[PDB]
């Protein structure tokens, strides 16, 4: 049941017309955001508005992502998503994940006065951070997403606050559509499901790089964690192995010590 | 002008029909709430809904507050507004405070995509916590409220996330209008300026404890005095807004409870005089 629900959430995020007022909670604080999404002529339309403070806005048409900020000059990049809108979990190909993750039904509750299916996303080998997701039972849109460290402490929370689904594409989305916008070593142990994309690795959800240079007098063993990001440096033989990305320290360490020359 | 704006925010919160989806942030976490307010026939109507988890709701019809919670039995109490609704600051008589507080204009910014006036509410004697308020420029409704300790760290935060003002009274506020709902031996000798005694009680449980409640119109605290026991100790605990200060002098256990900096609760206790 659970894996199919998660795929439906992915698809709903992409096909429905909707607006979410949400909050993004981390150790820096709580940020207020508004995300609008629509599909016109099989083309994705989106706006991410930042809701307090300076009027930072990012819009998507197709394929191009345009950035607006008072005083600064608007510019357009290529992208399939708006960075830091919905959590990256929502973009997952859950079918790819399914052999090496458990999707666990944890029951249901309300978020934003809407009944929600609650589902844990956990890697089977115990090597990774995990999610929980609360998804709207009716629309399947994500209502809350927690990223959890292995000790169960929350690293990131995303929380819808209010909440509407539209049948007909809204005025501002139609206006958006027509708008004038700016023109020698291998890692011998890896966690299950990670494959190579420095060497960059992904399991379809989390990613990390493994870097190896020659060791210098300045090479040190260190372990730094900033939020999602872990930086692990290790000196073996004449090499400085550096691992960077969304991994528990213990598992970053294990990758390093299993690099064979 | 800042004092006048704050009075207008007070009045707007009471007289307009509106809905606020908001969050309450403190050390415990972030809580999602929805607050609806209306005035029908010069009577306040309100609902506080709790937006995640179990469906707890509180309604106000005039002066009865009614509490609803699945599995439990609904009950109605008397009150002027829903507590832990809008911040208590919003109900202040800012005219009473004016000889003791500064109302300081700190500029303007956006909250919930609305332009807001930003105002600092500061006790002049440096004795109290302070607020900042972000108030909607058009409606004057409160958009954000920070309670700050004296070191400027925030103890509590109200923020609106969205935001609707109605000319007309809603369907649920009309349904609500017509619904079936349930029916001594010691003075303190130093007090910060503006605080006055609201009430006094004595109650057992059976040694008497004598309490006096104090308010300046914004902040409140109680001074409590019982006989000292072998278990009575000096302690100082702060939870958020709430400070609990216990001291043992003579044969008395003085306990101060409420919205006060630790150093000022301590000064109240050491200035209680026993006898005359």
Domain residue limits, chain B: 1-184, 185-276
DSSP chain B: -HHHHHHHHHHHHHHSEEEEEEEEEETTEEEEEEEEEEEETTEEEEEEEE-SSS--EEEEETTEEEEE-TTSPPEEEE-SS-TTSS-GGGG--HHHHTTTEEEEEEEEEEETTEEEEEEEEEETTS-S-EEEEEEETTT--EEEEEEE-TTS-EEEEEEEEEEEEESS--HHHHHHHT-------EEE----TT-EEEEEEEE-----EEEEEEESSS-EEEEEEEE--TT---EEEE-SS-EEEEEEETTEEEEEEES--HHHHHHHHHTEEE--
Enter the tokens of residue B142: 């409160």
DSSP annotation of A80: S
Assign a CATH topology to domain B1-184.
Answer: outer membrane lipoprotein receptor (LolB), chain A (2.50.20)
b (16+ CB within 10 A) / e for A129-142: bbbbbbbbeebbbb
Q: Which of A106, A102, A88 is nearest to A192 (CA)?
A: A102
10 Å CB burial of residue B154 (0-12, 13-18, 19+) is: middle
SS3 A75: strand
| Stretch (H or E) spanning A144 | strand A142-148
The pair of three-digit structure tokens given for residue B45, joined into one six-digit string: 């109507």
A163, two tokens: 């909440």
Domain A1-183: CATH superfamily, name plus number: Lipoprotein localisation LolA/LolB/LppX (2.50.20.10)
For A194, the 3-state DSSP assignment is coil
Following CA atoms B142, B148, B154, B160 in sequence, which dihedral angle do they give, to the nearest 10 degrees? 0
What does the buried/exposed string (b/e) look like for A64-95 if buried means 16 or more CB atoms within 10 Å of the residue's CB?
ebbbbeeeeeeeeeeeeebeebbbbbbebebe
Instruction: Say whether B162 and A162 touch across the interface (CB within 8 A).
Output: yes
Total Cβ atoms within 10 A of residue A240: 19
User: B268: how many CB neighbours lie within 10 A of its CB?
Assistant: 22
Measured distance CA(B155)–CA(B144) in Å, rounded? 13
Q: Which residues are paired to A58 by β-bridges?
A: A48, A67
Contact state of B25 with A21 under an 8 Å Cβ cutoff:
no
Q: Identify all chain A residues contacting B57, using CB atoms and an 8 Å cutoff.
A: none
> Collapsing DSSP states into helix, strand and coil, what is residue A70?
coil
Distance, CA of B227 to CA of B208 (rounded, Å): 8
Note whether A135 and A5 are within 8 A (CB).
Answer: yes
CA pair distance B16, B170, nearest whole angstrom: 12
Residue A43 and residue B4: Cα distance in Å, rounded?
A: 50
**Contacting residues of B for A30, CB less than 8 Å apart:** 23, 25, 30, 159
Report CA-CA distances (Å) from A260 to A122, A188, A245, B17. 29, 7, 20, 69
The residue with tokens 């501002």 is A172
Q: Which residues of B51-79 are buried (b: 16+ CB within 10 A; e: fewer)?
A: bbeeeebbbbbeeebbbbeeeeeeeeeee
Instruction: Tell me the CA distances in angstroms from B83 to B79, B88, B93, B141, B176, one per residue in order.
Output: 9, 8, 17, 17, 19
Whether B161 sits inside 8 A of A159 (CB atoms) is: no
Q: Long-range CB contacts (< 8 A, 24+ apart) of A40-43?
A: A40/A169, A40/A173, A40/A174, A40/A177, A43/A177
In terms of Cα–Cα distance, which of A17, A156, A176, A5 is closest to A84? Answer: A156
SS3 at position A150: coil
Backbone angles phi, psi at B53, to 5 degrees: 75, -155
* Closest residue in chain B to residue A144, using alpha carbons only: B52
| Method for structure elucidation | X-ray
Q: Distance, in angstroms, between B237 CA and closest chain A CA?
A: 25
> Which residues of B fall below an 8 Å CB-CB distance to A?
21, 23, 25, 30, 32, 34, 49, 51-55, 109-113, 144, 159, 161-162
CB-neighbour burial class of residue A12 (10 A; exposed 0-12, middle 13-18, buried 19+): buried
> A144 to chain B: which residues are within 8 Å by CB?
52
> Within A38-90, where are the H helices?
none
Contacts of B115 (CB under 8 A, 6+ apart): B108, B109, B136, B137, B138
Contact flag A21-B162 (C-beta cutoff 8 Å): yes
Best of A161, A162, A172 to mutate (most B CBs within 10 Å, chain B) = A161
In chain A, residues preceding a discontinuity (C to N beyond 2.5 A) are 183, 197
Residues of B in contact with A153 (CB under 8 A): none
Locate A180 and state its tokens: 């004038």
Q: Beta-carbon neighbour count of residue A4 at 10 Å?
A: 12
B49 neighbourhood in chain A, CB within 8 Å:
113
Q: What is the CA radius of gyration of chain B?
A: 21
Rounded CA-CA distance A139/A111 in Å is 13
Pick from B198, B220, B261: which is nearest to B92 by CA? Answer: B220
Measuring CA to CA, how many Å separate B132 from each of A151, B107, B118, B147? 36, 11, 7, 7
What would the two tokens of residue B158 be?
């109200």
Measure A256 CA to nearest chain B CA, in Å: 37
**CB-based contact B113 A34, cutoff 8 Å:** yes
- Residue A144 in contact with residue A116, Cβ under 8 Å? yes
């Amino acid at each position: 049941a659970s894996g199919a629900l998660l795929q439906q959430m992915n698809l709903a995020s992409q096909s429905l017309n909707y607006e979410l007022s949400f909050i993004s909670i981390n150790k820096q604080g709580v940020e207020s955001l508004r995300y609008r999404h629509a599909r016109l002529d099989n083309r994705p339309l989106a706006q991410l508005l930042q809701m307090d403070g300076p009027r930072r806005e990012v819009v998507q048409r197709g394929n191009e992502i345009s950035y607006f900020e008072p005083g600064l000059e608007p510019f357009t990049l290529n992208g399939d998503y708006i960075v830091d809108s919905l959590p990256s979990l929502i973009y997952t190909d859950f079918k790819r994940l399914s052999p090496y993750y458990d999707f666990i039904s944890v029951g249901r509750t309300r978020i934003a006065d809407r009944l929600c299916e609650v589902i844990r996303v956990v890697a089977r080998d115990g090597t990774r951070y995990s999610y929980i997701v609360w998804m709207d039972t009716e629309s399947k849109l994500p209502m809350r997403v927690d990223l959890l460290d292995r000790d169960g402490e929350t690293l990131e929370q995303f929380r819808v606050i209010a909440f509407n689904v539209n049948q007909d594409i809204s005025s501002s989305m139609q206006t958006l559509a027509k708008a004038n916008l700016p023109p020698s070593w291998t890692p011998t142990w890896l966690p299950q499901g990670f494959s190579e994309v420095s060497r960059l690795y992904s399991d379809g959800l989390f990613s990390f790089s493994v870097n190896v240079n020659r060791a210098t007098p300045s090479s040190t063993d260190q372990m730094l964690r900033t939020g999602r990001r872990t930086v692990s440096t290790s000196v073996r033989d004449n090499a400085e192995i550096t691992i960077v990305g969304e991994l528990p320290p213990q598992t970053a360490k294990r990758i390093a010590e299993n690099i064979k020359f």
